[PDB]
Subunit: 170 residues, 2 copies
């Protein structure tokens, strides 16, 4: 189309992803890329007829959940300050009662520390936290091969994530 | 490669972009996609031999600059709280004395309000701010055609950004 060739959907829930894809198709979108830390969401994107995926191999998505938005924001803000100081690239978005934080470009020991602070911050502010991805490099290599067997044509990875993973492979 | 087909570089400076691309090529990267609000950075990515670009049509990058990181973070945190409440998707990263905030999925009037808060917050915390992109939809359509004439093969756009732009076109 006139504005581009590919639309990028960041998918945090299978149902929300399928609804978003259908809305874009009705507006006349032809190619939709799906980004997720959740391997099951990317497999569902392929099943729906997509073939462009954005993976997160070395990083993770932290999801804070709670009815008080100001408490989600206080938890998220501490994660953001720490992650940026460690040199990570962050993607944030509000989705109902959920605040999603996609973190890339930090080594395994730093990812482990951030995942621990997420649990601590959730207890402090009286909210729940979910962590998606964070796998070792062998799990990533296995899940990418599975996406390819299921008919992925183009798999994209954040450069900072790819550089962390290459250093870890060596 | 084994981890994917395409590496994504978020480029905020032409020189930093060219250095990043060269580092990835030395590590054996074959296809590198460049993302920027800055049309000149995307044209430079094409000149260097790239052909996959991620554009920002309706949104903007806010860049806070200053020697005190705690002051950059206080300015950034207020932008993050406001932008998330308005339903925008945000991308953040520290780059030397710069804090970069890529904002998509808010209408023109809300983008205008956020750009004003950025100026105000910069004055409050004694730091400088730069705004990149924020163009009208006609400028986006013109700059996409220019990227295509300069040899772009695949242009990606965030779905939230594309939906804002489609509503604005109508
Ligand atoms: Co991403
Ligand atoms: Co982006
Ligand atoms: Na903290
Ligand atoms: Na504020």
């Amino acid at each position: 189309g006139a504005m581009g060739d590919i639309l990028i959907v960041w998918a945090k829930d299978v149902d929300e992803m399928l609804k978003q894809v259908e809305i874009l198709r009705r507006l006349g979108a032809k190619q939709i890329a799906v980004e997720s830390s959740d391997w099951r969401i990317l497999q569902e994107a392929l099943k729906k007829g997509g073939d462009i995926l954005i993976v997160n191999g070395g990083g993770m998505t932290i999801t804070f959940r709670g009815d008080d938005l100001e408490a989600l924001l206080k938890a998220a803000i501490e994660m953001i300050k720490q992650a940026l100081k460690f040199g990570a690239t962050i993607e944030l978005s509000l989705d109902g009662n959920d605040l999603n934080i996609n973190i890339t470009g930090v080594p395994e020991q730093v990812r482990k520390e951030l995942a621990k602070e997420a649990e601590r911050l959730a207890k402090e502010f009286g909210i729940t936290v979910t962590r998606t991805g964070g796998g070792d490099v062998d799990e990533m290599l296995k899940q990418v091969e599975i996406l390819r067997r299921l008919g992925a044509k183009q798999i994209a990875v954040h450069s900072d994530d790819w550089r962390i993973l290459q250093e870890a492979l060596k």
